[PDB]
Structure 1
Amino acid sequence: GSVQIVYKPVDLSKVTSKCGSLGNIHHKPGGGQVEVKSEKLDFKDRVQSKIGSLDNITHVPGGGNKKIETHKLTFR
Structure 2
Amino acid sequence: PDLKNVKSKIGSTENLKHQPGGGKVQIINKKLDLSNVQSKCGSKDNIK
* TM-score computed with the length of structure 1 as normaliser: 0.20
Structure whose residues are more often strand by fraction: 1
* TM-score computed with the length of structure 2 as normaliser: 0.27
